[PDB]
Design a protein around this ligand. Structure first.
Ligand SMILES: CCCCCCCCCCCCCCCCCC(=O)OC[C@H](CO[C@@H]1O[C@H](CO[C@H]2O[C@H](CO)[C@H](O)[C@H](O)[C@H]2O)[C@H](O)[C@H](O)[C@H]1O)OC(=O)CCCCCCCCCCCCCCCCC
Ligand code: CLA
Ligand code: CLA
Ligand code: CLA
Ligand code: CLA
Ligand SMILES: CCCCCCCCCCCCCCCCCC(=O)OC[C@H](CO[C@@H]1O[C@H](CO)[C@H](O)[C@H](O)[C@H]1O)OC(=O)CCCCCCCCCCCCCCCCC
Ligand SMILES: CCCCCCCCCCCCCCCCCC(=O)OC[C@H](CO[C@@H]1O[C@H](CO)[C@H](O)[C@H](O)[C@H]1O)OC(=O)CCCCCCCCCCCCCCCCC
Ligand SMILES: CCCCCCCCCCCCCCCC(=O)OC[C@H](COP(=O)(O)OC[C@@H](O)CO)OC(=O)CCCCCCCCCCCCCCC
Ligand SMILES: CCCCCCCCCCCCCCCC(=O)OC[C@H](COP(=O)(O)OC[C@@H](O)CO)OC(=O)CCCCCCCCCCCCCCC
Ligand SMILES: CC1=C(/C=C/C(C)=C/C=C/C(C)=C/C=C/C=C(C)/C=C/C=C(C)/C=C/C2=C(C)CCCC2(C)C)C(C)(C)CCC1
Ligand SMILES: CC1=C(/C=C/C(C)=C/C=C/C(C)=C/C=C/C=C(C)/C=C/C=C(C)/C=C/C2=C(C)CCCC2(C)C)C(C)(C)CCC1
Ligand SMILES: CCCCCCCS[C@@H]1O[C@H](CO)[C@@H](O)[C@H](O)[C@H]1O
Ligand SMILES: [Ca+2]
Ligand SMILES: [Ca+2]
Ligand SMILES: [Cl-]
Ligand SMILES: [Cl-]
Ligand SMILES: [Fe+2]
Ligand SMILES: [Mg+2]
Lengths: 81, 57, 341, 32, 38, 65, 503, 37, 172, 30, 39
């Protein structure tokens, strides 16, 4: 034995399931909302389906300058009207 | 002539291969899945041209 | 007495999860590498670095998600979050491929951490450190493929990207540009990996099929005791069987198990050496004698020249989209193609 | 308020995992 | 003087120092509390 | 074993095998130096890498004429 | 008996014979240097430092001699292409001779130390057992290293008492050995500033001396002595192997990216100079400056040094080689004879067209011509049946400016196409391919070969480090684990602290 | 001269000989194509 | 083909015509041989690590085992004790029979699936095809790594057996 | 001579198979 | 009550397993609808 109480005692315990029937749905719903509210997009800078190209543009906004890459991306995003 | 288009591929050491490039070459695409034992050939020369060794092996 | 000794005491307690001094390095770096990969493959794009979608959020599946390498223009920038490129902006940092170096570096230090763990636990338990020693092969492979290889090329861009299909692309790229299958170091690698699997299989099967009957059950697993002194299978019968089947057989158990360490470890090390060569495009690409003959003789054909044709196809058809920073435009008329296809 | 090394280890993996699975579930209903 | 990247270097340096320091403060504290009995 | 003139001269330099300073000795100071060394390596690395960019420091063949 | 892979372990408690073995290794290495230098002198062609410098000729130790100031031969030539120079004794030949002799002497010393292994010096005065006091040895040897490092910086590199070091302009046109002053500001840590190399050796030398004195005068802490097994010479082997693979990785790095200590006139240009079209940019700058000053096209392009043009050619890119493509670069594309001049391509309408250059990644590459804005204007078609851009259709011509073909224009498609094919490699040169029976296949330079060898060796030496560190720290169990290893140390529940029997 | 006490006899058993020769011969069979190139 | 380069030819054309890398049975095959190699090294190193001391430093540890001896030559409790601490106590096998069965089963089953991969791609049930699977709001194709793989496969396809096809589809 | 070399090495390997099998050091039980 | 065993492990296993089936199932549904569906 390592000193801690066995997992099969915990996941069969009423206390455990009392705690986690709250905490697990809450976490799940939170991640759900992270996506459905659109926050994920803005946190990670990921294009929405309407945001890969401006309407008539067809060239990838490839980063080409190392030290003003940040500015280059900001410019590309500005170019989406 | 692996692909049956009279474009013979050299597999053996004496015919210009080393250990890495060498091979016994699969039988001809003209044969397909037909059984091609030595005695189906008109000659050993024909047999060799069409990849008989591959099937035997 | 002495905070250092107290700390050492605590780090080395026999808990469910051993921590150790090594854990101080291992756990944060491994957690950050794994977490980075899950975060990136779930939420992060590769639009601005590759012109690729690469996350579940964009519609990729498990096979196609990846944390992709930075744009070629970044060179071999460490691409630190607080560095001159992202300048502290987390979002831009993700968009510039920061997560790739984040994962490669935290992962490297995590591997150092794990091997240190192997040493520390071996030392505490009182066994020889052969497990750590064997882990040197994963190390060599990771370091040569994810660090040395791109450091030799133009930029991190040509490092492997962290994803299933991305890795497949890495494989095909190495075939097309490096003719990597022709490289004797890769071949030794393959021999070590397949030979390792062979040894795994044959050894397992052999032990399981030369077991002594040590119980009455038809399921023979219960008839073993960890503390028992006796071998659970017959080395003598195994030896006779293999001697008569294959001609030769192990007779020494210690040598058998050392050999099982030696084969795959040696294989992976050899493959690492090949990749170090490829960092410099120092390829096993051609046989010059082959080329001289084929150039002079339009009827001379081998599987080697056939495979070069395939490679030329790969390069021409894949480069414009795979290397977007080059802005390749290959008119239809220059694409190499056989008849009809 | 007593934690253990094991509790921490378990939850640093489990908490984000449930969260992420919520996110990915949600993603299944995104339309272009 | 101090370029932006030098400022950034100091920021990373300090960030890393704070991380290692917090880690060791916590570890040492826990080890002080949770002593091995002999 | 054999003594020689040079051996006799060199003797004191190989005479304190196993001799140690008590406890931790200068380990703390050593630690300090190791830390400083790490920072030094981080600096030259980042300069070579163009992650750290300094006035008057052009990391290029076009450094000096 | 001893297994074959352990035969040398008989040296472990035999300091005299260890010194003999090390002496023999040193003799072998010095001898290799001597021999290598002699072979290179016997094969080196000094007649053209412009288009046939050492790095084209598979020279490996010659550039290291040149780097530190040995540039001349007793036969009268120098690598900078001078004549009637007196190099003194320290010609390439002198250096070689010196190394051969050194080798001989080290061999004799090895014999002596092998026969007279049982020296009093090696015995511990107390126990009478063989004993090396490794910490004090580290002090002594570090002190020596410091004095030598400092002296190298302060006298040799400065030219205060010595030749200096190889330096050059940023395009590697006018390299020579010069005295270099230390740089004591931040640019001292610029890899491309030689002053930094000098300052480095001076300061690190001093630090080496002080730290050496410390390690001579101050005994190790008991805790470090114990933890690092400072009584065991294998610990020194482990950490030394680590330091060495670190160093090896560093010299691989600076050889591949370039630094003040890996000049392009000695080792060849870098792959990155081709990636970024470094030389092409400088060339265009000179040409444009000339035109603005009123020169004609022929004049502007003829003012470009052949050497500069030669750098702008992919056959000199160290990332175009092959692992088993052996020998000097000359064995591939040939011995460069002359610049043919700059090729300017035009279509029937007189628009200038530019050939798309081959990237280092590609063994083969198509022939595509665009205008200044990158619009495809001509090419060499694979399939002909739906070709729109063939040279014949587009009436492509090529005119040459500078070089051997200066003022000449070609209009027949085969010739135009041939020069276009050459144009994907950068500037175009005439080669002698008969002298060495060259096969036309690109080989890497000494920059490449050096980098390869040292990256591989560094990586293998990582394993050496791991292995010997393991052997050091697990010396007690490396013949097997304690036969009575209690089932309370390896099992759970018995001990609080792992390994600690007392808990 | 006093005999050196650090000397040790060396061994290579037959199986090691066979393994070693197999290794050498197979390595040569592999690398020779690249040596002729 | 019965040859080294011929084997590579076979592999490359196979990838062109079946996208075998994106086939789950080939992936299981890879898991089988990578895994086999891993467990091979792992087992080797653990048993080696727990050899009971039977020799001196100047002789091979292998002489510590005598062919046909009845006693096990290593300490499986020590080996397990290391491995359980390296991960957690229960990922480890303390039962040598179960352990060796695993060593047999992992590569054997993985390779079974590799064989079935080739054997079912024999009837052109091919790897996953996600070519142009991601599309934006307008309808522009957003490439994924699957699409780059497709570009490479296209190179292989159009170049292979360059004189053999007269008609636009390679149907066998 | 290349062909001769390849065939020579192969032949030596087969010979080695013969000796390794029929002239092995015999396993002996203790 | 932290009492270990109050809920039968086979029920826990069954429910958990069914949950896994449900979520993976939702992901496969997602392969045919919305983003990544090719439609
Ligand atoms: C086994 C151990 C197990 C554990 C391992 C885990 C360790 C983790 C930490 C490793 C960190 C490595 C970071 C290296 C970053 C780098 O290299 O970044 C690269 C930089 C150089 O920057 C590059 O330089 C290139 C050349 O430019 C030069 O040339 C240009 C064209 O002429 C211009 O003139 C330009 O101004 C000039 O700088 C290009 O510009 C690239 O875009 C640019 O990225 O080197 C540098 O920072 C420093 C270079 C010297 C030190 C190198 C040591 C480490 C690498 C060893 C491997 C060598 C690989 C060679 C191939 C084989
Ligand atoms: C031990 C665990 C560990 C390790 C080894 C690393 C390592 C790394 N991290 Mg990670 N990280 C960690 C934990 C760790 N991290 C944790 C817990 C978090 C969450 C808080 C992060 C979050 C994180 C982010 C967001 C990023 C990193 C990044 C990095 C990389 C660059 C870091 C750097 O430059 O530090 C620089 C600073 C130091 C090394 C501190 C040195 C302190 C010195 C030794 C003190 C010297 C004192 C001196 C001796 C006293 C002398 C006195 C005298 C003056 C009188 C590096 C690979 C960067 C990266 O990956 O880029 C892509 C990055 O962007 N990390
Ligand atoms: C006796 C004095 C002496 C002198 C003046 C020379 C001079 C030369 N040697 Mg020779 N050589 C010598 C002895 C000498 N050698 C010995 C004893 C050996 C056998 C080991 C050799 C074997 C040898 C070889 C194989 C080669 C040479 C070469 C050369 C030439 C290039 C030197 C060079 O680039 O080194 C570069 C030196 C370094 C980069 C030094 C590295 C120092 C490391 C990093 C120190 C690390 C440990 C240290 C303790 C760290 C702490 C220090 C502290 C201050 C902080 C030059 C003419 C080259 C040549 O051109 O041959 C024809 C060459 O290839 N030599
Ligand atoms: C630091 C190492 C080093 C480097 C980088 C160089 C670099 C160079 N040498 Mg020099 N040389 C060296 C050491 C080195 N040399 C040594 C030690 C010798 C004496 C043997 C020589 C003698 C020599 C001669 C006679 C010549 C050169 C030449 C050259 C140039 C062409 C190199 C070439 O074709 O390589 C080709 C490289 C290879 C084919 C790679 C071989 C890889 C091996 C075979 C792999 C082995 C794998 C192993 C067996 C696997 C074990 C597996 C097991 C563990 C399971 C190049 C500048 C040539 C030149 O142009 O001179 C003017 C030339 O003629 N060198
Ligand atoms: C400074 C470098 C150095 C030194 C002095 C040593 C010294 C030693 N090693 Mg270590 N080792 C090193 C680096 C070093 N090693 C490196 C880089 C690796 C990874 C390749 C290793 C991996 C290693 C292992 C796995 C083992 C040792 C062992 C030993 C001990 C016995 C060596 C012996 O008798 O071999 C005798 C060797 C032969 C009879 C033939 C070797 C032929 C090789 C394979 C090819 C020929 C190379 C050629 C001659 C020279 C090339 C030199 C240059 C290119 C570097 C001895 C203390 C052994 C030990 O611990 O014993 C108790 C042991 O098992 N070493
Ligand atoms: C010492 C042992 C004594 C016997 C020697 C054993 C020789 C065995 C085979 C080794 C030779 C390999 C090269 C064969 C091809 C050849 O002919 O070369 C021939 C080349 C010379 O190249 C020749 O040059 C000529 C002009 O002088 C012509 O151009 C010839 O055409 C050209 O072949 O030989 C060398 O270059 C030797 C030096 C190689 C140095 C490479 C450094 C990097 C290697 C590191 C590898 C690490 C791998 C570790 C793996 C673990
Ligand atoms: C204690 C708790 C520890 C928890 C574990 C935490 C660390 C382990 C994390 C493992 C991650 C494994 C991959 C996750 C895949 C995923 O989320 O798919 C999420 C995707 C989501 O589905 C995609 O979503 C998009 C939404 O925009 C689109 O709709 C796509 O069309 C759709 O395919 O599901 C799938 O791709 C299908 C299921 C495939 C599942 C992977 C198979 C298992 C392979 C894993 C092998 C290695 C890992 C073993 C680890 C055990
Ligand atoms: C193989 C992987 C899966 C095996 C599952 C167990 C087999 C199934 C089996 O036979 O035993 C089942 C076992 C049940 O444990 P018990 O409840 O019996 O535990 C009782 C003990 O606590 C009493 O000492 O399952 C686990 O422990 C899963 C732990 C998952 C991991 C939890 C922590 C994760 C942290 C990450 C890893 C940390 C250590 C590594 C450091 C790098
Ligand atoms: C039934 C599943 C069939 C496929 C797996 C077969 C297991 C054995 C295959 C490897 C054989 C190696 C050479 C024989 C090695 C050998 O001799 O084995 C011996 C070993 C022990 O034999 P025993 O005699 O003790 O037991 C077998 C019988 O006598 C019944 O008691 O056999 C087993 O444990 C069989 C267990 C099968 C129980 C069902 C297994 C379910 C596996 C599920 C895998 C699904 C993975 C899907 C992909 C992710
Ligand atoms: C990056 C970064 C960071 C970090 C973060 C982290 C650390 C995260 C984590 C994260 C995580 C930690 C996540 C997780 C996730 C998970 C998932 C997503 C899972 C999934 C799963 C599944 C899906 C399953 C599947 C399966 C398998 C695998 C087998 C069996 C069967 C089945 C199918 C069930 C920081 C902040 C420092 C900073 C910034 C950067
Ligand atoms: C005695 C004497 C003398 C003499 C001396 C001499 C004469 C010496 C010589 C010396 C020498 C002359 C030496 C040499 C050496 C060499 C070496 C030592 C080499 C080595 C090599 C190697 C090791 C290699 C390897 C390899 C190969 C082979 C292949 C590729 C890869 C590699 C690179 C790895 C005198 C008179 C002075 C006087 C005194 C006495
Ligand atoms: C990093 C290693 C620094 C060791 S520091 C060491 O630690 C002891 C406490 O255990 C103190 O009592 C002692 O005075 C101090 O020098
Ligand atoms: Ca819509
Ligand atoms: Ca010729
Ligand atoms: Cl084909
Ligand atoms: Cl057809
Ligand atoms: Fe076993
Ligand atoms: Mg969907």
């Amino acid at each position: 034995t390592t000193g801690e109480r066995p997992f099969s005692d915990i996941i069969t315990s009423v206390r455990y399931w009392v705690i986690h029937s709250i905490t697990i749905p809450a976490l799940f719903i939170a991640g759900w909302l992270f996506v459905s509210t659109g926050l994920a997009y803005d946190v990670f800078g990921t294009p929405r389906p309407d945001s890969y190209y401006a309407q008539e543009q067809r060239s990838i906004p490839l980063v080409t300058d190392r030290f003003e890459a940040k500015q280059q991306v900001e410019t590309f995003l500005e170019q989406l009207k | 002539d692996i692909d049956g288009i009279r474009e013979p591929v050299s597999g053996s050491l004496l015919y210009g291969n080393n250990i890495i490039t060498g091979a016994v070459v699969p039988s001809s695409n003209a044969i397909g899945l037909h059984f091609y034992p030595i005695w189906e050939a008109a000659s050993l020369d024909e047999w060799l041209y069409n990849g008989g060794p591959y099937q035997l092996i | 007495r002495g905070w250092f000794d107290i700390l050492d005491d605590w780090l080395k307690r026999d808990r469910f999860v051993f921590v150790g001094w090594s854990g101080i390095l291992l756990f944060p770096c491994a957690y950050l590498a794994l977490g980075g990969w899950l975060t990136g493959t779930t939420f992060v794009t590769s639009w601005y670095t590759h012109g690729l979608a690469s996350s579940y959020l964009e519609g990729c599946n498990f096979l196609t998600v990846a944390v992709s390498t930075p744009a070629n223009s970044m060179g071999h920038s460490l691409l630190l979050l607080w560095g001159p490129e992202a300048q502290g902006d987390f979002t831009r940092w993700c968009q510039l491929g920061g997560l790739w170096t984040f994962i490669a570096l935290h992962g490297a230090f995590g591997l150092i951490g794990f091997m240190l763990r192997q040493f520390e636990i071996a030392r505490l338990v009182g066994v020889r450190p052969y497990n750590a020693i064997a882990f040197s092969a994963p190390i060599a492979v990771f370091v040569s493929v994810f660090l040395i290889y791109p450091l030799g090329q133009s930029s991190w861009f040509f490092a492997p990207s962290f994803g299933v299909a991305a890795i497949f692309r890495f494989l095909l790229f190495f075939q097309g540009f490096h003719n990597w299958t022709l490289n004797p170091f890769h071949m030794m690698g393959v021999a070590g990996v397949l030979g390792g699997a062979l040894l795994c299989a044959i050894h397992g099967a052999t032990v399981e099929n030369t077991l002594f009957q040590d119980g009455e059950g038809a399921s023979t697993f219960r008839a073993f005791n960890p503390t028992q002194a006796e071998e659970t299978y017959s080395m003598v019968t195994a030896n006779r069987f293999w001697s008569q089947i294959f001609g030769i057989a192990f007779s020494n158990k210690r040598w058998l198990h050392f050999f099982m360490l030696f084969v795959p470890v040696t294989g992976l090390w050899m493959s690492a050496i090949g990749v170090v060569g490829l960092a410099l495009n120092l390829r096993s690409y051609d046989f010059i004698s082959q080329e001289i003959r084929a150039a002079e003789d339009p009827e001379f054909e081998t599987f080697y020249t056939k495979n070069l044709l395939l490679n030329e196809g790969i390069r021409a058809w894949m480069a414009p989209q795979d290397q977007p920073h080059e802005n390749f435009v290959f008119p239809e008329e220059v694409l190499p193609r056989g008849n009809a296809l | 308020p007593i934690f253990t090394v094991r509790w921490v280890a378990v939850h640093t993996l489990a908490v984000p995992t449930i969260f992420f699975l919520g996110a990915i579930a949600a993603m299944q209903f995104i339309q272009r | 003087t101090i370029t932006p990247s030098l400022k950034g270097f100091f920021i990373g340096l300090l960030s890393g120092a704070v991380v290692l320091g917090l880690t060791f403060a916590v570890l040492i504290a826990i080890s002080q509390i949770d002593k091995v009995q002999r | 074993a054999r003594r020689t003139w040079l051996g006799d001269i060199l003797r004191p330099l190989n005479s304190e095998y196993g001799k140690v300073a008590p406890g931790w000795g200068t380990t703390p100071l050593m630690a300090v130096f190791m830390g400083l060394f790490l920072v030094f390596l981080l600096i030259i690395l980042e300069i070579y890498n163009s992650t750290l960019i300094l006035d008057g420091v052009n990391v290029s063949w076009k450094a000096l004429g | 008996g001893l297994p074959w892979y352990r035969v040398h372990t008989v040296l472990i408690n035999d300091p005299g014979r260890l010194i003999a073995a090390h002496l023999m290794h040193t003799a072998l290495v010095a001898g290799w240097a001597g021999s290598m230098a002699l072979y290179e002198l016997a094969t080196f062609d000094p007649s053209d430092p412009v288009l046939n410098p050492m790095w084209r000729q598979g020279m490996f130790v010659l550039p290291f001699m040149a780097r530190l100031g040995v540039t001349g031969s007793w036969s009268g030539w120098s690598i900078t292409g001078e004549t009637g120079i007196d190099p003194g004794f320290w010609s390439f030949e002198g250096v070689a001779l010196a190394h051969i002799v050194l080798s001989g002497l080290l061999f004799l010393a090895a014999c002596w130390h092998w026969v007279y292994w049982d020296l009093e010096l090696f015995r511990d005065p107390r126990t009478g057992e063989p004993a090396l006091d490794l910490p004090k040895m580290f002090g002594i040897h570090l002190f020596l290293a410091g004095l030598l490092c400092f002296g190298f910086g302060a006298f040799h590199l400065t030219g205060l008492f010595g030749p200096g070091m190889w330096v050059s302009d940023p395009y590697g046109l006018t390299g020579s050995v010069q005295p270099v002053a230390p740089e004591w500001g931040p640019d001292g840590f610029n890899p491309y500033n030689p002053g930094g190399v000098v300052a480095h050796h001076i300061a690190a030398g001093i630090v080496g001396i002080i730290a050496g004195l410390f390690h001579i005068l101050v005994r190790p802490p008991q805790r470090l002595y114990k933890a690092l097994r400072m009584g065991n010479i294998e610990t020194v082997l482990s950490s030394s192997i680590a330091a060495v693979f670190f160093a090896a990785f560093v010299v691989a790095g600076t050889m591949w990216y370039g630094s003040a200590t890996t000049p392009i006139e000695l080792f060849g240009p870098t792959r990155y100079q081709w990636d970024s079209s470094y030389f092409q940019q400088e060339i265009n700058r000179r040409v444009q400056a000339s035109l603005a000053s009123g020169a004609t096209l022929e004049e502007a392009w003829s003012a470009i040094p052949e050497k500069l043009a030669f750098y702008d050619y992919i056959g000199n890119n160290p990332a175009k080689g092959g692992l088993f493509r052996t020998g000097p670069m000359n064995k591939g594309d040939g011995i460069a004879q002359a610049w043919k001049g700059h090729a300017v391509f035009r279509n029937k309408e007189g628009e200038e067209l530019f050939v798309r250059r081959m990237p280092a990644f590609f063994e083969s590459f198509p022939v595509i011509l665009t205008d200044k804005n990158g619009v495809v204007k001509a090419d060499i078609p694979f399939r002909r049946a739906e070709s729109k851009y063939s040279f014949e259709q587009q009436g492509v011509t090529v005119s040459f400016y500078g070089g051997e073909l200066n003022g000449q224009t070609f209009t027949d498609p085969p010739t135009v196409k041939s020069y276009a094919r050459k144009a994907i490699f950068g500037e175009i040169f005439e080669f002698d391919t008969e002298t060495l029976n060259s096969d036309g296949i690109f080989r890497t330079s000494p920059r490449g070969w050096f980098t390869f060898a040292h990256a591989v060796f560094a990586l293998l030496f990582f394993f050496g480090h791991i292995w010997h560190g393991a052997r050091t720290l697990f010396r007690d169990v490396f013949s097997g684990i304690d036969p009575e290893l209690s089932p309370e140390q390896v099992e759970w529940g018995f001990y609080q602290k792992v390994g600690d029997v007392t808990t | 001269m006093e005999p050196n006490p650090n000397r040790q006899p060396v061994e290579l058993n037959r199986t090691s000989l066979y393994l070693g020769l197999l290794l050498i011969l197979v390595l040569a069979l592999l690398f020779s194509s690249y040596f002729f190139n | 083909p019965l040859g080294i380069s011929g084997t590579f030819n076979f592999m490359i054309v196979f990838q062109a015509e079946h996208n075998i890398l994106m086939h789950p049975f080939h992936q299981l095959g890879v898991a089988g041989v990578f895994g086999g190699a891993l467990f091979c090294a792992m087992h080797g190193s653990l048993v080696t690590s727990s050899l009971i001391r039977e020799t001196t430093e100047t002789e091979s540890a292998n002489y510590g085992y005598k062919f046909g001896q009845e006693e096990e030559t290593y300490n499986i409790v020590a080996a397990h004790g290391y491995f359980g601490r390296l991960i957690f106590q229960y990922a480890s096998f303390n039962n040598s029979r179960s352990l060796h069965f695993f060593l047999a089963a992992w590569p054997v089953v993985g390779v079974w699936f590799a064989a079935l991969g080739i054997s079912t791609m024999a009837f052109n049930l091919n790897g996953f095809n996600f070519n142009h699977s991601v599309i934006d709001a307008k309808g522009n194709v957003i490439n994924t790594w699957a699409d780059i793989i497709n570009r490479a496969n296209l190179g292989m396809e159009v170049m292979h057996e360059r004189n053999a096809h007269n008609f636009p589809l390679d149907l066998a | 001579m290349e062909t001769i070399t390849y065939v020579f090495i192969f032949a030596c390997i087969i010979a080695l198979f013969f000796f390794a099998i029929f002239f092995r050091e015999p396993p002996r039980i203790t | 009550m932290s009492e270990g065993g109050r809920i039968p492990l086979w029920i826990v296993a069954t429910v958990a397993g069914m949950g896994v089936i449900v979520i993976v199932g939702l992901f496969f549904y997602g392969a045919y609808a919305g983003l990544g569906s090719s439609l």
